[PDB]
Design a binder for this molecule. Structure first.
Ligand code: FEC
Ligand code: FEC
Ligand SMILES: [Fe+3]
Ligand SMILES: [Fe+3]
Ligand SMILES: [Fe+3]
Ligand SMILES: [Fe+3]
Lengths: 169, 169
């Protein structure tokens, strides 16, 4: 039934959205650590990736509203704090790869429920996740192979992500 | 699948409701004829049964709303007019028996859809439909076995169904 179809898509959309809220908090917590450690270029790209996750959360929420549902406000799982730099990139690569696997299953549900608009949304966001995955794998590999030589290059670099973002005040 | 289940129950509820809307118009059409004939007692009971059907239509509508549906406004089947007195009871008896058969089917769907509240609503209404059936069966029999001897007894009796209907004005 139509209603049936909508409910099942809203469910995978809220599951995905919950994963995005987790990622925002997880990535920003690592950003606070990298910034504190004064590894500016690393801190900056971590925050830019977090902002892509914010955009995903928002796109998911907007489609949930188009389908008449209520966007979840709760993140999936727990944020790991106090990770060492190698652990940050290893676990973030792991998480990105798991997110792509999950969204790929959610997409198939969309296809089964005859929801082309939502499946296209998953497809576009999955391609962004792949860009995130490649990034994290590359940094992990530099840290693996080069160690402190690589740290020494990032030490003291600019941490700016650009102009402060649009706000009300 | 909550939405499949609500949708399948709402479908038999709207089906039963359209059988009630037809019944209301069918029995009141016969009431106007009986009243015109001045067979008071028969006219009064025919309107009282119509009012019972109004209450069934309403109960079906309210449950449909609880389940998030839209109560139908269309009646099932055609109203037959100018029915003679023997045909009124014979046809009302047949229609009540057909309704009990239909609703026992609808009850079945409710139970299959795990809708206990709606199943109980049908069981309760089915027992009222049996009261109507018995009534029509008895009148048809008297008319068939005693003919005009029984009608002379009904002639000129009061047709009042009680105090005037609560209204806005
Ligand atoms: C959408 C959305 C969500 C999800 C909320 C939801 O419930 O769906 C959302 C969630 C969050 C959450 C948590 C945090 C808090 C992170 C933390 O401290 O753990 C959180 C934090 C930040 N957001 Fe965020 N967001 N977000 C935008 C949209 C969304 N954001 C847009 C747009 C911009 C654009 C800013 C700009 O262009 O200047 C933006 C920028 C930031 C900055 C950057 C500040 C700066 O450099 O000035 C920080 C920090
Ligand atoms: C419920 C409901 C429906 C279905 C509406 C829907 O679309 O769901 C509904 C539908 C109809 C329809 C047609 C008719 C018109 C019949 C015709 O003329 O063919 C129709 C006709 C009558 N209704 Fe009716 N109904 N109905 C109530 C509930 C419902 N009624 C309740 C309650 C009372 C309570 C009256 C009282 O207590 O004084 C009540 C009374 C009457 C009287 C009584 C007049 C009198 O003696 O003053 C007549 C005639
Ligand atoms: Fe994402
Ligand atoms: Fe990502
Ligand atoms: Fe009825
Ligand atoms: Fe009936």
């Amino acid at each position: 039934n139509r209603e049936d179809r909508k409910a099942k898509v809203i469910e995978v959309l809220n599951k995905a959205r919950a994963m995005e809220l987790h990622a925002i908090h997880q990535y920003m917590n690592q950003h606070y650590s990298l910034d504190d450690m004064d590894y500016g270029e690393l801190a900056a790209n971590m925050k830019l990736i977090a902002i892509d996750e914010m955009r995903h959360a928002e796109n998911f929420a907007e489609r949930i509203k188009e389908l008449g549902g209520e966007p979840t406000t709760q993140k999936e799982g727990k944020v790991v704090t106090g990770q060492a730099v190698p652990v940050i990139y290893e676990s973030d690569a792991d998480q990105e790869d798991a997110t792509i696997e999950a969204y790929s299953q959610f997409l198939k549900v969309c296809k089964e429920q005859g929801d082309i608009v939502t499946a296209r949304l998953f497809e576009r966001i999955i391609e962004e996740e792949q860009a995130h995955l490649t990034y994290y794998e590359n940094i992990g590999s530099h840290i693996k192979n080069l160690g402190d030589t690589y740290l020494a290059k990032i030490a003291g670099t600019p941490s700016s992500t650009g102009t402060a973002s649009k706000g009300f005040v």
